[PDB]
């Protein structure tokens, strides 16, 4: 089963700073709906839409945003297939590496070939994130370099 959800580790833990940030967000949303709503025609609609967010918390809104991002991109990219390929590579080499980056303005996740990565300056560290220098040498098609570096 693949259900990777962002969860608030202590959902019943609220502090003053969280409340202040929630108040800031609610005030910002109130100003925006005041701006867009045209003289009472749909102002009450916006109040109805945002009244259910007064019972929310800062942590709840952040968790919500994270869950929608992860859910959408997992359903889009079919990430479990990427993880399956990485798992097979881990079985073959004992090394499982993934790269996450921004391409075209959208976040993307890719599986790094263990034969096309040079990891330098690690401290007997099992994790790849502890490395201080990484080189990725691969032969890209012209279309991909233009799709990534047109700007």
């Amino acid at each position: 089963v693949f259900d990777f959800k962002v969860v608030v580790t202590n959902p019943n833990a609220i502090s003053e700073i969280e409340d202040n940030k929630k108040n800031e967000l609610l005030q910002r949303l109130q100003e925006m709906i005041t701006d867009t709503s045209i003289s009472e025609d749909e102002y009450n609609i916006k109040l109805e839409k945002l009244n259910d967010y007064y019972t929310y918390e800062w942590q709840d809104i952040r968790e919500v945003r994270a869950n929608e991002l992860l859910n959408h991109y997992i359903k889009e990219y079919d990430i479990p297939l990427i993880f399956n390929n990485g798992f097979m590579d881990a079985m073959t080499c004992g090394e499982e590496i993934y790269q996450c980056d921004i391409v075209g303005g959208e976040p993307v996740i890719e599986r790094v070939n263990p034969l096309k990565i040079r990891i330098f300056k690690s401290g007997y560290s099992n994790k790849v994130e502890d490395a201080d220098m990484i080189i990725l040498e691969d032969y890209w098609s012209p279309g991909r370099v233009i799709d990534t570096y047109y700007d």
Partner: protein, 126 residues
């Protein structure tokens, strides 16, 4: 546009400073200015000035040496001083330290320009 933006990796990331160029001086522009927004409804800016958080740095003005030494400004004009203060933030708009440093430097330059303006109007009225 390369002015105050880092258009890389298919995105458009900004540090908050708005390089307002390509329009021209107020006298040379038939609409007297670029008219960035409507708020005074005629919010007009020229090619030399830059904006950060709805406050304008004047390019026509100059920094007296007294205001150069304290607040430690670099550029000869206030706009150039902000174009010098934001250089580190241009390549890293998402760094928290860079944003805080930009916030502090922008406040310093804004206060320096306000001091210059009040000094100038006091001298002119005298």
């Amino acid at each position: 546009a390369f002015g105050g933006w880092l258009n890389t990796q298919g995105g458009d990331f900004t540090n908050g400073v708005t390089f307002i160029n390509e329009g021209g001086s107020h006298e040379e522009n038939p609409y007297q200015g670029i008219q960035i927004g409507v708020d005074g409804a005629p919010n007009l800016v020229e090619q030399g000035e830059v904006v950060y958080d709805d406050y304008v740095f004047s390019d026509r003005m100059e920094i007296p040496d007294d205001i150069r030494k304290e607040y430690k400004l670099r550029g000869k004009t206030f706009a150039k001083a902000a174009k010098s203060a934001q250089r580190e933030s241009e390549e890293r708009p998402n760094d928290p330290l860079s944003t805080k440093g930009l916030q502090a430097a922008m406040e310093r330059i804004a206060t320096a320009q306000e001091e210059a303006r009040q000094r100038k109007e006091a001298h002119r009225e005298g």
